[PDB]
Amino acid sequence: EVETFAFQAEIAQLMSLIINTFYSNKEIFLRELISNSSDALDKIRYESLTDPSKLDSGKELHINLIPNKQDRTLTIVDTGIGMTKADLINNLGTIAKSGTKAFMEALQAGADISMIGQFGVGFYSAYLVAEKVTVITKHNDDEQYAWESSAGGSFTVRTDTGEPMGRGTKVILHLKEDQTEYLEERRIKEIVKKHSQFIGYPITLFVEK
Numbered sequence: 614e615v616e617t618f619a620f621q622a623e624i625a626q627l628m629s630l631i632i633n634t635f636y637s638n639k640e641i642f643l644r645e646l647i648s649n650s651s652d653a654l655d656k657i658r659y660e661s662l663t664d665p666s667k668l669d670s671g672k673e674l675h676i677n678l679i680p681n682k683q684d685r686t687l688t689i690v691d692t693g694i695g696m697t698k699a700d701l702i703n704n705l706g707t708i709a710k711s712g713t714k715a716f717m718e719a720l721q722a723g724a725d726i727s728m729i730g731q732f733g734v735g736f737y738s739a740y741l742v743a744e745k746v747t748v749i750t751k752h753n754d755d756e757q758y759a760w761e762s763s764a765g766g767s768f769t770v771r772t773d774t775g776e777p778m779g780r781g782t783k784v785i786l787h788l789k790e791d792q793t794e795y796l797e798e799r800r801i802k803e804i805v806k807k808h809s810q811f812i813g814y815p816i817t818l819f820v821e822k
């Protein structure tokens with residue numbers, strides 16, 4: 614049972630601007646997604662200080678980067694706090710509306726797309742390199758959910774039947790055909806070292822078989 618939702622106009626406009634604007638510094642998508650994972654891990658680390666049982670779904674706090682040349686996917690996995698259904702459908706987009714307006718106004722005034730993180734809407738930078746994005750996520754208080762969007766003004770949410778995730782978030786970037794450089798170990802290493810070298814959680818770059 615798959616539910617389809619329309620993005621709010623302002624977010625649709627942002628995604629279309631990201632997809633259609635000519636902008637060569639696409640590699641910053643990885644810094645934004647890793648930064649998102651690191652915030653989610655901070656959040657569950659803090660919550661577990663006053664409630665240790667919140668780590669029963671998994672004590673490890675880490676980020677995994679998994680390229681798959683066969684599926685042409687790059688997956689960013691974290692064991693952070695995860696997202697509820699209300700987050701996917703409503704809350705995160707509600708928050709993003711003001712960041713989106715501020716961002717678009719800065720862009721008209723001379724800012725550039727690489728500054729998207731300073732407006733809290735960095736997640737959407739994934740569409741610099743992905744034609745489709747799947748988010749698998751599990752929060753302690755909700756079921757496991759699969760969110761998916763190929764842009765075009767809509768996204769879907771369904772209960773996920775795949776492997777149980779414990780707690781956390783898996784972002785699967787279905788890469789555009791001309792962006793397969795981001796599946797190369799040497800290229801991901803370079804990007805992590807340049808933009809994420811001081812993240813306070815272990816980042817493991819899986820190598821391909």
Ligand SMILES: COc1ccc(-c2n[nH]cc2C)cc1F
Pocket residue numbers: 649650653691693694695696700705736782784
């Ligand atoms: C607090 O709301 C959240 C915002 C983002 C995430 C997230 N974790 N890993 C990737 C993402 C996008 C989790 C949240 F709970």
Ligand SMILES: COc1ccc(-c2n[nH]cc2C)cc1F
Pocket residue numbers: 649700701702705706709733734735736737748760
């Ligand atoms: C479910 O769709 C999402 C909508 C927004 C975000 C987000 N995370 N951090 C900042 C934003 C705008 C993540 C999502 F998965």
